[PDB]
Each structure stands twice: as structure tokens, then as C-alpha cells.
Symmetry: D3
Subunit: 237 residues, 6 copies
Amino acid sequence: ATPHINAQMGDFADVVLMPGDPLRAKYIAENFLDNAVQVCDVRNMFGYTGTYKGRRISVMGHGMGIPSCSIYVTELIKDYGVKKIIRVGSCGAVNEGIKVRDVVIGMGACTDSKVNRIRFKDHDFAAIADYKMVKAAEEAAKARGIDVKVGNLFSAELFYTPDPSMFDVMDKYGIVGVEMEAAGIYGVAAEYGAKALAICTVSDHIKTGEQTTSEERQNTFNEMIEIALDSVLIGDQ
Amino acid sequence: ATPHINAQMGDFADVVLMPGDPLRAKYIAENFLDNAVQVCDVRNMFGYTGTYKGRRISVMGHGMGIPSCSIYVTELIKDYGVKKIIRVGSCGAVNEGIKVRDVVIGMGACTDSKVNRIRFKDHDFAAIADYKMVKAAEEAAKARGIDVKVGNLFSAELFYTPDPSMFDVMDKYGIVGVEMEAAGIYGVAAEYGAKALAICTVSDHIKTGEQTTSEERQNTFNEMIEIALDSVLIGDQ
Amino acid sequence: ATPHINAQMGDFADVVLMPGDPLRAKYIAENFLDNAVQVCDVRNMFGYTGTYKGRRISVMGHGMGIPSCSIYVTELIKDYGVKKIIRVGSCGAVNEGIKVRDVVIGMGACTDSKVNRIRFKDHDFAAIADYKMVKAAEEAAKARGIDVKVGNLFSAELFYTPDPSMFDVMDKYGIVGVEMEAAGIYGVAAEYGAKALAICTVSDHIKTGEQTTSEERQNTFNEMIEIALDSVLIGDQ
Amino acid sequence: TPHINAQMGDFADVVLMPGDPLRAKYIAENFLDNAVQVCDVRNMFGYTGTYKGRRISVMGHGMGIPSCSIYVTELIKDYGVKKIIRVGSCGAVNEGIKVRDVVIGMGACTDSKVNRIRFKDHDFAAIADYKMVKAAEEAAKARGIDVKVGNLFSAELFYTPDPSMFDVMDKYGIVGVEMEAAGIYGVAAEYGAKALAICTVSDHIKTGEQTTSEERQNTFNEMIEIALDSVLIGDQ
Amino acid sequence: ATPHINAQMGDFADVVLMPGDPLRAKYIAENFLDNAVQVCDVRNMFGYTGTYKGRRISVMGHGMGIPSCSIYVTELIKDYGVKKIIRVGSCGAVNEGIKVRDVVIGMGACTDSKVNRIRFKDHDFAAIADYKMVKAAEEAAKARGIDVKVGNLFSAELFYTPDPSMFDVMDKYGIVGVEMEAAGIYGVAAEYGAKALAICTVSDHIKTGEQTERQNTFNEMIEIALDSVLIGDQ
Amino acid sequence: ATPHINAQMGDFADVVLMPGDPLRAKYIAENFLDNAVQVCDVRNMFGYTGTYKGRRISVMGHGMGIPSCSIYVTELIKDYGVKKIIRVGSCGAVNEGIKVRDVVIGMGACTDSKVNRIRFKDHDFAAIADYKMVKAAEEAAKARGIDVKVGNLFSAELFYTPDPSMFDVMDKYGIVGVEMEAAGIYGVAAEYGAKALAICTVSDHIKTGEQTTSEERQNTFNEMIEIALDSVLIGDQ
Ligand SMILES: Nc1ncnc2c1ncn2[C@@H]1O[C@H](CO)[C@@H](O)[C@H]1O
Ligand SMILES: Nc1ncnc2c1ncn2[C@@H]1O[C@H](CO)[C@@H](O)[C@H]1O
Ligand SMILES: Nc1ncnc2c1ncn2[C@@H]1O[C@H](CO)[C@@H](O)[C@H]1O
Ligand SMILES: Nc1ncnc2c1ncn2[C@@H]1O[C@H](CO)[C@@H](O)[C@H]1O
Ligand SMILES: Nc1ncnc2c1ncn2[C@@H]1O[C@H](CO)[C@@H](O)[C@H]1O
Ligand SMILES: Nc1ncnc2c1ncn2[C@@H]1O[C@H](CO)[C@@H](O)[C@H]1O
């Protein structure tokens, strides 16, 4: 009943996992959730609701970029009663302390977008995740024997950046991964009084160009999804 | 062979029509082009290539927002040799001189995004369409007896704006419609040396809120697509 | 009587051609208009009114720079009822696609001035000409065998720029000519609800170094004025 | 160094920092064992002692981003300090936060231009070190104190010419207004160290709630104990 | 010869007085200088050179606005060897401490232009006059019994401002007068290593509405400027 | 009392000299004023009131940086009735025309702080001293046979700057010394309707690293203080 989501109140759980690709949302629903049913498909932005260890959880794509994910997250919170959003994505690393296949958590998200300046009187709004969600994801990873790197993501406006020198600045300031949405999701969560978190797997190294096999990448993605879902159960305690 | 488009050089025509919704690209391909074949589907962002009165033309969604459409348009130009991009979308009107169902052409596109400042040393880049494309579209509309309003669109960053007072500023400055991509597409076209145009139909009036029936809405969209396709042929003369 | 123009309502036609030099306004009035009379001379900024094929047309200098031309154009519109402004100027080229002696039209005008940010809540206002005026001038030129380059002008704040590296950015982004007024005139036209256009002749090339003579310049200037005047009649329909 | 008259080794690798050098003196004398003064240039007192056997330093940072940046930069680059815990006071702007509450700035918003100077005029999210935040929250839980973790706002002008900004801070959930965390976090990122800002809410900017001097001192004491306990948890 | 000035090196003195109106430059040269000769007239922007008590002094219009005066002042400094520029203009008042007919001096000039940010890495450049020139003008005025108001001018980009509320901010911050050039002239003087000063007469009040006497006050300003040149030389 | 000053109205003279270091305020009070009594000590920011040649004068530290000195100066003006503030400090030189041990006066103060943009609608506020105070200080130095250089200081935000290239821009633009407070003090004086001046001695040459003995340094500081105190008496005439 919203312009970008053809669902009804109650169709989504109060916690929604969101990759950018709607086909990754389909993959998560089919392989990690039990009895997941599709709840939306406007603009092919697929969303599903099923259970994980008996707990109701939804998964839906958010598209690429701050403006796209802002629309979906805003509607989920204000029109569907969603309380927590976990972006589950991929990112490029810029620092030598971070390696391909690492799992990173954006406790903060830097950005070159103007959206938070539009909201915050042109001052610096520190786009941050919800602390308890970060803690739950780090504890879930520790229980699985995975060491997550917690720090700042960089949410880029231009994937094909006209300023590649900025990657060196990100490296110097310890950015853990480059993606295009966390700062926008965090801005919406603060504006609408909800909670969010962005967890990402490092799929490529922007500075080194390091590569891996498709199998290795899929394995890391799977590990990250399990951590996100386990974190929901820890968060419920 | 690109990260967001699973196609190969030659799969796309040198002219691509792009609505934001991939399902609208599917509708255009099936109802306005002859023998259209799907050429891409990564992230469900459907793209097709067929013919219009014998002329090869492609149609593909671009997603929502400047960062999303920037990725697709940049890849089409630099990896697929696309020369002209015609965004075919919907927009909201803010001025009394514009009415619901009107067809508007963005000769320019204002914006609250920082992408053009990132490209243009933080000065004011006037994000403009290619003049010959604007002229071809206006002449195509004239041949069909369809009135068009040529002026500035406003490409917004936040659909759910925290600053609705900006709509009054847009009104005063003669903005013809509010959408979320034209300024970004125009910036990419200038950066990569290609040509673009954004043609939109007014679906809602942000101030009054005029109303229509589904049929009327569909009829106006069809009019916009015929103008756009006809403009390609005129542009080739 | 305004502070910068010592004329009375009705002294100016509803269309005014404006070069920066008042002596060029004089040359236009005396050699291209019939029965031209001087209507203003405050600060030596000469303005005249005469006829072209029986149609009333005015010509007046606007001085140099955005703040200067803004004063004159605002007064012409708000105090003298002027509806259309045609800047008839000179500019320097920065792109190799543009040659000296070429006639360029600013469908848009980029700038490093803060005037449009002051008007548009610090967002990006695309400073644009009126489409119908652009089309009339392009058609007038085409009828005379002159191929006008329609694109973005760059209206500079500092003729003696402390940042010459910006010329390379202008070149990359396709700027057709460098002058110091179009973006300001376009901003005034949008603010006051009037229409404007800037047509310029390329006097020199900033990138390659190509220069011109006084004779070549004079010949090209005459052509520009003939195009501008014919465009007024086309615009009248 | 130009602002610290000490020598390498005089400071522990963890330094607690209130803005007032006299609060640093109070902490050294009442919470640390055998604390000795290690610096006094510009009256910015710093001390080193032990807490439950662990070496810990405490030093004032002055008021405002420029002042605390000088001291924190010197501590990290010239004295080998690895972790900085600002232990201060702040004003609340949101109804969800009460006077006497203990807040932790996982992030710090600001109207300063310092991070823009560092980060190509883009938005650097000034953040604390996660493990330090977690240790402080766990230390507070062990003491039966509920901490509110979120964004501080590090102001440039205490006597702001724009009081309407407090309403924007309230709307965006800022937990407290102080004048340093965003600057400390920017230095920590630039110099590769770790920081955290924990503050007690001493006043409510929106409501004006009052409390006795005794109540404020008790809350300050509680917060210092949490910060020191957090160092021990962080060492594990 | 330069693109905007059709003179030759040596035609201008090392000190140039500049009003915005070229006709005011003409008036100054004919009534306050001896043996004044016109040295330039491109775009009708008249410039002259004559003497004041035997000392060579030039006078030339600068046009309206920062970009316009920047072109003329830059060329005078870099192509004609000018060392000092004295803008002699008119301005509007916004503060109740300033009255119409007052003579004000911009020791600083605030602005809404982006030119000094373009020059100064987007930081805040305080556009200032040369101190010794300010002092010379203030002392010249004091000797004549004229009490000059020395402070900040505001050099506006838009005469017909879309933001009139900014006049209340100028008033609160003590701006002494609103004109459209001083911050640009000061920016050029710093960039090129020269010296400048902007002295203006208050033609009217923006806050109270008091209107205006102009000729008499203008004459006084020019007398102060000229005497300030000789003091500056000593 | 005020939050940062434990004094009462009347404890401070109407003129206050302010070094950044409270121990330098103590030194000035004990060695240059007669019968100075300490009037405040909150946060160890010592302030004193005594007489100089019979004239009541106060001296108090202001701490380091714009935000710190802004608090103290604002409270002195609005709560303690102070009319004139004379910052007496040290600075670093960037220009060859300035030498170590020189005494410089900030008629203006440039800055990279955002405080004056926050006050002045994001435009350029020229942070300036009060002219009569500047003149009094220059005349006081002349009486003592001490040459002074009057120009623009640069009030830095980051002592350990991440952008040392800005020192070359400061040099080119004639900056006479680099400190961290004058622009802030000047902004407060304008906002609160008071008067201020910053006089500094060059302690180091950021470009050459010029050097001296402690005795020479102490001698130059004493010279600056004598000039400052003498300027108060001249200012009263
Ligand atoms: N290096 C990267 N830069 C930007 N976005 C990235 C990168 N790697 C992965 N992504 C993610 O995938 C998309 C871009 O391919 C974005 O939506 C973002 O979430
Ligand atoms: N009023 C509107 N504001 C913003 N985008 C709009 C509007 N109306 C239609 N759109 C279009 O549809 C999407 C937002 O629903 C955007 O991708 C944009 O192209
Ligand atoms: N290269 C150029 N840069 C700026 N303005 C130019 C240039 N060439 C011509 N002009 C025009 O002439 C004037 C500057 O000589 C301006 O008013 C502008 O209209
Ligand atoms: N309301 C407040 N606003 C700003 N700083 C505050 C506030 N309350 C406490 N502080 C702290 O105390 C000092 C200002 O009194 C700052 O250094 C800051 O750390
Ligand atoms: N109120 C005013 N605002 C702007 N410029 C003014 C004002 N009064 C006088 N001037 C001067 O006259 C011109 C505008 O009339 C400018 O060039 C400026 O020097
Ligand atoms: N080179 C310098 N850069 C910045 N501040 C300086 C410098 N030299 C002296 N200072 C002064 O001393 C302090 C920094 O050491 C500041 O408060 C400032 O007043």
C-alpha cells in the first residue's frame, strides 16, 4: 500500500535483513529462512518473510545508493512497523589491515553524500549504527569463531568515482570498507527513531586488487548471513 | 562483463531508453518494440534490445536515485558504447503552470546532490541535456499534437524530504517536475562525453494533488514513450 | 526612474540585446537598428531603442561580471517590463571541439559565483536559458549556414583566475565558452519570471592558444547580431 | 613537548581526561593509588598512578576541539598513549535522557570544520573505538548503572548564536552536548589510536532540570569508577 | 595595452582613486586635480592622471561589483605598476550608529562572494585594507573635523538581494556600510602584494529609511582621500 | 558567578589583557601591575585585577583555541561588563617579511574555523580588531621605539595541521602570524558589541625555524606587554 512496496502492515517482521540485490534477498530467504514467503515485488525489489530458529525475520533488497535505500528503509520503518534494519552487503577494502573475505561491521559510516547535511543544518552528523545491534553481531561472530573488524564504512555516491585519491584518505583514516548505503540507512534510522546496522563481507581490495574464487566469496557471504541472523536472536534477549 | 550488467559489447543499441522501474522497461520492450530480446538481468535490472520502425533501440531500468542511475549509465557509455540515453519517467509537479498528465522535458536538472560538486571543483555545474535531443523530443511531441513543457527538473536526494519548504523554492524558480535522476545522468553524460535527455510525465501535483484513473495514467505514459521513440528517429536524421 | 537607468517606462522594447560594452550597444543600435534613439546613459552604460523590420528592439550594455549584469537585467525586467534578454557577447574557448570565430549558445551556464546558491537554498540551480529562445537562435543561425555550438558556458568570477587548472575541468566537461555573465542573467530571469539567452562569439582559445584579429572578430560579431535579431522575429511567431 | 612537560614513560598507555585540570587532580587523589603529577604546563595538570594495580594516567584536556586536539595528539604521538577516555559532563537535549544519566558517545556529531579539513570536505563519522565502548557499557552493567549509548554533539560555541540547533539535535537523538569528543575521535583516527567519551548529564538544555551539588558529585564518582573498571575489562 | 585599459605604462600614477562611476572619475579629475588628462576610455571606463599639490595622482572608474572592479584593479597593479588603490564610493547604512552623510572606512570588508574562498582554500580570508592607508585617511578626516566610522563594509553580490534578512545580520555585527567592491579589491591587493583602502559616503539608510547634501559630502570624501595620499607618502 | 569564572560583577576592569597561558597571566599580574589580586581560578584559568600607572587593568588566561577563548571573552563582556579585550600572545611566522622576535598586530584574523560562518549566514565575515585599539597599540610601540607589523593573523583550528601546504597560501596572502584565537575573539566582540585586539610576538618561523635564547624570548614578551599596557592608557585619552 506504499508507493514502492506492495505489502500490508504485518507482512514484515520487526527485523529486516537487507542486501542491495533483490536476488540476494531471494537467496537468503530460500536457503537461510524456514518457510519464507514473498511479500513484495514492486520494481522487482523482492522482499520475503520467514523464520530463523522459530523467530520471524524478513529479508528484502534495498537497491544501490543512498537515495534508493533511504526510500525502502523509510517505508519499512514508518509504514510497516520495522524496528531494526540489518544491511547485509559487500564492500571494497582500502586499508592493508583489512583483507578480502573479512567480515566488517560499520559502527559508523562516513560519506560524500549531502543527505545528512540536508538533515542536520549543514553540520557533521556522525551516521552511526545502534550499539546493541553492533554488540549482538560481534558476539554472534565470536560464537562462530569469526573475528569481525568494527569501524567506519564509507558510503560512496559515485561507484565510478572521479576522485580515486579519496581512497587513500579513507585508508589513512581507517575506513574498513567502501559501500554505498550505510550512511543513508543510519541517517533514516536517526530521523525516524529506529535502529540499524550494516555488516559487510570484503569482496575486493581497492588498493591491492586481491582476488579469490567464487566459492570462497560465497562461503564468506554465507558466514556473514548466519552471523546476522544469529545476532537477531542475541538481540532479542 | 561488467559488475552490474551481464551483457556483452554489441548487445545494446547506441540509444537506450531508461525508466527507473525494470518492469516498465519490460513493458516498453514488449509493447513498443519489435522482437525485443532481454540482454541483462543482474539485480533484476532488466534491459532489452529490439527495433522501432526498423531502428535498433534498447530499453533498461536505472533504479532509483542519482547513485543508482549513475552506475548503469556510466557502464552503458563506457563499456557498451552507448551514445544517447533517454530517461523516460514520472515526476511530481510543484508549479501552477504545470498540470498532472503533462509531459515535461528537462533541458536542465537542478539537484540537492553533491555529485556534480564532487566532479566540478565544488562550483556550480549546470546539469544539462543535449540540445539536439531536447529539440528532437519537442518536435516529436509536436508531430503527435502533444504539448510539452521544457525547463528545469529537480533531481531530489530524499524522496521523503525533511525539507518540504524547498518545494516552494522550486516553484518560484520555475522547476517543471521533481524526480531523482536527471541531474546525475546529465553529470555522467558530461563526464564521459555522451548525450542524455530526461522526459517525464507528471504523475502527481505535490501542492494540489490532482487525481486520475489508471487508464488515464497508462495513456499518458504511452504518449511519453511514443514521443521518446519517435525522437530517436528524428535525432538520426 | 531607477538608480542605474535614467529612462521612463515604455522607453525600452520588451526584448533587449545586451553586450558588456556600452560602445558595442552603440554600434549595434547605429548599424543594425532603424531610427535608434539613446534612452539611458547613467555611468556611461548606454541603452538604445529602435526597430528591426518594424519590430521594436532595444540594446544596452550590461557591464562586466555577474553582479553588474544582474543590476541592469533586474531593473529592465522589474521596472521597464522587459520580457526577454539576449546577451550578445564574446567568450574564450577551452575545448578542442570549439574553434575561434565559432558562435556558441549557452543552453546552460556553469559558474563559480555564489549567487544561485544564495537564491536556491545552497543547492545546485541549473542556470538555463529559455528553450524557445535557444531554438529560435539556433534556427536563425542554421538558415544562414552557421553551425552554432549549443552547450554550457562557464560564467567566471575572476577574469584573472588564481586557479587556471579549472580550465582543464571546463574542457573535460564540455564547456563551450568562458564569459562572466550568463549564469547571473539566467538566475535573474528565473527569480523574476522572465526569459533569457546568451549567444557569444569565440574570440580566443585558452587551451590551444589560437587567437584572432580585430577584423575577423568584427565579421563574426556582425553575424551574431544578425542571428540574434532574426531570432527575435522567429520567437514572436 | 610544547604543551606537556613530561618524558616518555611518564604516562600509562591509557589516559582518562576531563576538561578541567582540577577534576584530573580530584580523580588522581581520590580514585588512583599513589598518583604523582607528571605535567603542569599552562596549569594543565596530568598524573599517573594505579587502579587495582594497573597503571593509569589522568590529565585535563581544556575546553573545545582545538584545545583537546593538541593534548591528545601529543599524548599519542610523543608519549605512546594507546587509549584515551574522555570523562566529562554534558547537557541533554532529548526527553529520553535525564540529568544524572551516564551517556557514552559511540559517535560524536559536531559543527566544527576540523574533520572536513581532514577528510576532503566530506562527512567523517567521528567514532569511538568499539571495544572501549563495549568495555565501558559492561563496566556500567556490573555496577548496576544503565548507560545510554549514542551520539554526542561536540559544540564549537558554548554560547551558541543558534539555539534552534538544539531542537535538531533532539530530533536526531543526540544523547548529550559537550565540546570535545568529535575532535578527540578525529585525532584518534588520524594518529591510529583509540578513544572513548563517557559523560554525566549535568543539565538539561531543553527542560532546565536541577539537582543538588551532592547528587552531581555522586554521579561523577560513579562514572569515574565505570571508566577505570572499563580499563581493566579492556585489558582482558 | 591591456584588454580593458587602453593606456601605456607610466600613464597612471602609483596611487589611483576609484569611484564606481566613470563620470565620477571625470568629475574628480576636473575639479580636484590639476592638469588632468584622460588616459583610458575602453568600455567608457574613463581614467585620468593629474596632480594634487604637485604629486601625481590618478582617478578611474571601476564599474559595479566584485568581478568588475577586480579586472580593473588587477590590471592597474600588474600591468601599470600601481601600488595603492583608494576606492572612493557610496554605500547604504544598516546600523543605527551610522547616519546618512557619514564618511565610513572599511578596515575590513565582509562579503557573500566566493572570490576569497576561491583564493584561500575555502577558508575565511579577512579581506582587509592596508593599515597605514586607513590611518592616513582617518587622520586626514580628523584634521578636517570629520569623524569617520572605521569598521567593516559588506560588499554585496546582489544589489537586489533575494535575502533582505541579511541586512539585520549586518546590523547586529556592526557593518558600517553596504557597497559591492571593497572585499574584492582587498582580495586582489593581497593576492598581488599591493595596498588598498575603501572610503565611502553614506547615501542612505537601509534600516531606518533615512534618505538624503550628497555632493557636499562627496567633495569632503575626495578631499580626505587626496590629503591621505600625501600623509601616506611622508 | 558564571560557569567558567568564579568572580562577581566589578571584579574585572573594563579592559582585560589575555594571554592563552594562565601562568603568563600570573606573570603579567605580578611583574607589570601594581597590587594585583586574583579574581578567578576555575579550571586553573587564573585572572587578576591590579593597576598600571593608576589605571585599573585586568589580566586573565583564555586557554587554547577558538572555542576556549570564546567562552571566556563572551563571559567577560556579557557578565562582567568588559569593554575591551587585548589578547597578548605568541605566534608562528610564515612570511619572509616577518622575523622571529617581531611584534605583530592582527588588524584582521583569517581562520579555518567555522564559527564566523555559523554567525554570519555562511558568508565571509572579516574578523577584525577595533581600529582605535590597533592605532593605540601601534602608537604605544612607536613611543617605545619598537617597530610593529600590522596585518592579518591566521587563527588555526589544528596546531598539528594535516594540511601544512596552507602555510604557503598564508605566506602568499601576507599573513603576519599564526595563532589560534584572534578570529574567534573578534567574532565574539562583533556579536556582543565590544572591542578587541590581538598583539603577538613571533616565537618561531614555521618556514625557517629561526632560533633564540630564553632571555631574548623573555625580553620580547616584556616588550609586547609594555606596548599592550601603554596602549590602554593611550586608548583612554
Ligand atoms: N568497492 C565498492 N564500492 C562501492 N560499493 C560497493 C563496492 N563493493 C561492493 N559494493 C556494494 O555493491 C554495490 C556496488 O556494486 C553497492 O550497492 C554496494 O552496496
Ligand atoms: N514526486 C516525486 N518525487 C521524486 N521522485 C519521483 C516523484 N514522482 C516520481 N518520481 C520518480 O519515481 C521514483 C520515486 O518514486 C524516482 O526514481 C523518480 O524517478
Ligand atoms: N576569456 C574570457 N573570460 C572571461 N570573460 C570573457 C572572456 N572572453 C571574453 N569575455 C567577455 O569579456 C569580458 C572580459 O574581457 C567579460 O565581461 C565577458 O563577457
Ligand atoms: N551544555 C554544555 N554545552 C557544552 N559543553 C558542555 C555542556 N555541559 C558541559 N560541557 C562541558 O563543559 C565545558 C563547557 O562548560 C566543555 O568543555 C564541555 O566538555
Ligand atoms: N545600498 C547599496 N548597496 C550596494 N551597493 C551600493 C549601495 N549604495 C551604494 N552602492 C554603490 O553603488 C553601486 C550600486 O548602486 C555599487 O557599485 C556600490 O559601490
Ligand atoms: N605556530 C603556532 N601555531 C599556532 N598557535 C601558536 C603558534 N605559536 C604560538 N601559538 C600560540 O600558542 C598556542 C599553541 O601552542 C596557541 O594558543 C597560540 O595562541
